[PDB]
Design a protein around this nucleic acid. Sequence first.
RNA 1: AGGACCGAACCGACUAAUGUUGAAAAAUUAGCGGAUGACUUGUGGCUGGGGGUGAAAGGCCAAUCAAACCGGGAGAUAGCU
RNA 2: GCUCGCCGGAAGACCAAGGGUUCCUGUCCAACGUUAAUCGGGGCAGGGUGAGUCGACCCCUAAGGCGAGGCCGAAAGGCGUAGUCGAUGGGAAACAGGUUAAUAUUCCUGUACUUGGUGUUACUGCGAAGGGGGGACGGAGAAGGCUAUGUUGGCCGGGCGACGGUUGUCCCGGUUUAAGCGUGUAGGCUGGUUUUCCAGGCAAAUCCGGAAAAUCAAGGCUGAGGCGUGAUGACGAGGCACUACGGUGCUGAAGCAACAAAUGCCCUGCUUCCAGGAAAAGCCUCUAAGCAUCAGGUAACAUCAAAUCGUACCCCAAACCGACACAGGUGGUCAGGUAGAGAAUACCAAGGCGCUUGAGAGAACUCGGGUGAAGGAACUAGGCAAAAUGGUGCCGUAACUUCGGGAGAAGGCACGCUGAUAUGUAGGUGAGGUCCCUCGCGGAUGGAGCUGAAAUCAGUCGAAGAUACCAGCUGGCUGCAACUGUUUAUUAAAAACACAGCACUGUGCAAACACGAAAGUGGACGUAUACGGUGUGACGCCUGCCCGGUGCCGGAAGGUUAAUU
RNA 3: AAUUCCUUGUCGGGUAAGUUCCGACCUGCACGAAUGGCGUAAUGAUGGCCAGGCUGUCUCCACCCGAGACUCAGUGAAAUU
RNA 4: CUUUAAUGUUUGAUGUUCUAACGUUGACCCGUAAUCCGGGUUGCGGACAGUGUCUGGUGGGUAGUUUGACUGGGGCGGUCU
Length: 270
Amino acid sequence: AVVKCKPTSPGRRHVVKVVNPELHKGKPFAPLLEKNSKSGGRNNNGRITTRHIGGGHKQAYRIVDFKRNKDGIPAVVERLEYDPNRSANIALVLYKDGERRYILAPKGLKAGDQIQSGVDAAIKPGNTLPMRNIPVGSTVHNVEMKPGKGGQLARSAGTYVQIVARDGAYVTLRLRSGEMRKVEADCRATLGEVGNAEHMLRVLGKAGAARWRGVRPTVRGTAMNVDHPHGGGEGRNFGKHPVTPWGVQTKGKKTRSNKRTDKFIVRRRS
RNA sequence: AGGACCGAACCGACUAAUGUUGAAAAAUUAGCGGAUGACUUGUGGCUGGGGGUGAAAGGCCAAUCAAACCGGGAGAUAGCU
RNA sequence: GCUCGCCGGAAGACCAAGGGUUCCUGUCCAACGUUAAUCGGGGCAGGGUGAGUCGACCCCUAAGGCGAGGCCGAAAGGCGUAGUCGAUGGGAAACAGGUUAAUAUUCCUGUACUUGGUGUUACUGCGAAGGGGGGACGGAGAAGGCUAUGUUGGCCGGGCGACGGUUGUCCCGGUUUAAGCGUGUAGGCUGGUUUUCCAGGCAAAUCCGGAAAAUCAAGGCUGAGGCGUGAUGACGAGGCACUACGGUGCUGAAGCAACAAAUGCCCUGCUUCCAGGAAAAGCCUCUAAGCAUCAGGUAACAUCAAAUCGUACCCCAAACCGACACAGGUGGUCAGGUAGAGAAUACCAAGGCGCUUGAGAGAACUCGGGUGAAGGAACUAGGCAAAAUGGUGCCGUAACUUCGGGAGAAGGCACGCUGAUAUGUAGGUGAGGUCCCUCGCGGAUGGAGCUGAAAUCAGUCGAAGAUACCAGCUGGCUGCAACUGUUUAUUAAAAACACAGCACUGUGCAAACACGAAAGUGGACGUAUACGGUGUGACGCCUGCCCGGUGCCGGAAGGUUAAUU
RNA sequence: AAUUCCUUGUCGGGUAAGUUCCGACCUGCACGAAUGGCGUAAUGAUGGCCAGGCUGUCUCCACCCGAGACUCAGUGAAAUU
RNA sequence: CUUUAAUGUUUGAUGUUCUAACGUUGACCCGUAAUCCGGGUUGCGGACAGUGUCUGGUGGGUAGUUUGACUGGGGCGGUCU
């Protein structure tokens, strides 16, 4: 649920939290944990490639199963867990054979609900089936772009795509971006929407809340001297076209220079 | 509970006086600010010069920065002293 | 040597880093020491650093580095796999006492302990570069139970006072004792046991995980401290003999209890929160390939081994970094007494210093301070500076407000000492004894003794009772920015920079973008409720007109238009 | 007005006297709505202004305690020329 | 030799389809106790993509340079035969 704190201090007036008691108040499954060392926006050379990344709270990586290739085996949801590596929560599931795994938490899933993957699975939220069997006009998430590699689309808090058409070995989809894409009609997708919808209603409330996530402060560029096109000037001049560093527009200019796929796109967006 | 309050350590450096061939190539004294946090700190590590890093001042990069230092081209050129 | 003064959360003590003989002894005073110098971190010579348990080395690994082949690249070379290095992390074991001019948890004494090798005996399913477990981990907060430690009493020993009094409810001192072993408590977690079954744990598995039944609820694990042992010992205030007053042998009394009590231990705990909290090995198990009157495994005993390097000394400083014996800078550990909320502050203990030029005089003027008649900001760019306020408790507290605040608003009263209430109360602590008992480090009862506020009443001294150090000036109008924060190390801390929040825009993932001749890496082990860029900058009421120009996003009828032909 | 040249704009408030400050007027030299506009509690070593209190800031300095200055002994610089 | 059709070949454009180059930062296998790499199998793409040479456009993102003289100081202005 959404809760607004009280203004007992400057830094707590506009802060808003997303309270969810269903989350497990304990440690996660260690066998499914992995080190995740922070980078700082730097690469193998040691140079900052992506700015505004630094510090933050330590984090462990939860091995999530985006493929769902354990077909023909029911699995029950044990508990919902908080995942820092992503916006959405995860669910610890237990298969009949004794195997445990992490998955994305659908909209209205709970602990004790049963799910299954494959072609003969039931059409219910949480189940995973190839889109060749998913009815048209339905809603799915964690979509695969190439069969066998794992879900890549609709993985965020409250995201979902909609199957709108199916002609042959391909199926057309409208993504949360509004793009009308089509993929092969053999990619696995999971029914339902990822449930953390109220995640967007959050309000950090203070600067330190952005630093906990690893986001470093962002300096504009208008007051930036030899270091940026907008540069400087006596006062607040800014008498040039908006432009990135390295000299690119950033206020309308499109930068998609792929030309390789150019077949799966139909209604790019807007 | 709190980028909450007062206030030592700790990190800072707003004012004043001294000092200005100083005790000190930026400090001392009396006060001052923050002090559970975007805190502070130890050890080690990465980022290299038209490049790095930069809560951005053209700031910092070994008392040196509107392009570091050493060496070399090099006895640069100097219609000027 | 007798006094004086200073530090005493250090100006004391123990270390790392760093330095590298500055340590000790003797000797010398040319130079060095901001003076002299018999002295010295100076010169010369000699002497000094003793480890199975401390540390390094070693085993393991993080960031990261190198990187067989390999991918890439004009050469140089770059990235990176397998792997190998890499602590600031993890991983076996020693305490006390004594001793040297200089070393010791290293030597001596006493008591112990760990990991291994070999051998003997006995019982035996052993085996990994694999699987599983464990190792293994955050912040804040809350108490409770303990100890270090301290205070008092008691006991022991000594003492009866340079000046009035001081054989007593007087004074001084001491009252210490370890790891280990044995008990396994306060308290913490956990439901256990047996059999069957299984798409899982890369193959297997008795192990892990999972499923299904039965049978019991007490089973285990962890765990400070305490007690006992260690210890008929040691140390011991002090004496007896030598005593070159430099010390050595021997002897050596009491060696108890209560109260208070940590930031330390129980605690890697418990509760709670979101920002969701390393890895690997050692260790405990599981089997596979394979080996079985073998080999190996387990227990006991005996025996052997545990090498190598470091250890001196300074280490908030005269020995490190600062050109100096430089008001500087430098990380960790120990943390006494009185008052106190306190590691503040004042005065002291232990302990260590008086800061390497002195003497004398007592002008101007400067520096650092104290006081001040009457006035009280008239000073001045400006109340700069200085003065002033300053505490606990009670009462009381405005506009405005985002209802949290404003607010310690402002403002007013009371504070000492003695006695009594109460020969020291409320409270805390908790003995003996008694009762019970699964007979224990138990529970109940018991209230001794110890400790001990705050308040009231009366009385009393002083000019002054928050008497010292310590310790908010306050209020009113208003500009800028919301706020906490950040910045020109070394003249600018701000109205600038960040900021949460808003918006535009790009990006469908081999994403955009960025670093890179490239490979590739980051973005991200993320996937549009995401990422990047730009501008604005909490919140509230809002954000109007203009697309001619520039730019961006689209489109087409035609025109013009490169190489090429 | 952090924007106003003319300018110490004009009126009023506060003061014995106010180029500053506060509040209104609009004639906006040359505000203006995310290079955001108008307000805004709270905060500020922020800017400006007025009070109470307090004082050697001053009227107007005087005295005193200490370190230098001065003298004696010892050691023994510098800029400049 | 003036003329035009169904053909054959010729080459030109467009479109569809295919697979064999090429791609695969898809899946499985081996080297191999290796998310690299390579090989093999398969699938999806597929003569597109991407690369090389040439070429037009864009291009302060980054460089190399220029930006006159006289002048009752210089600049503005004016002037230069």
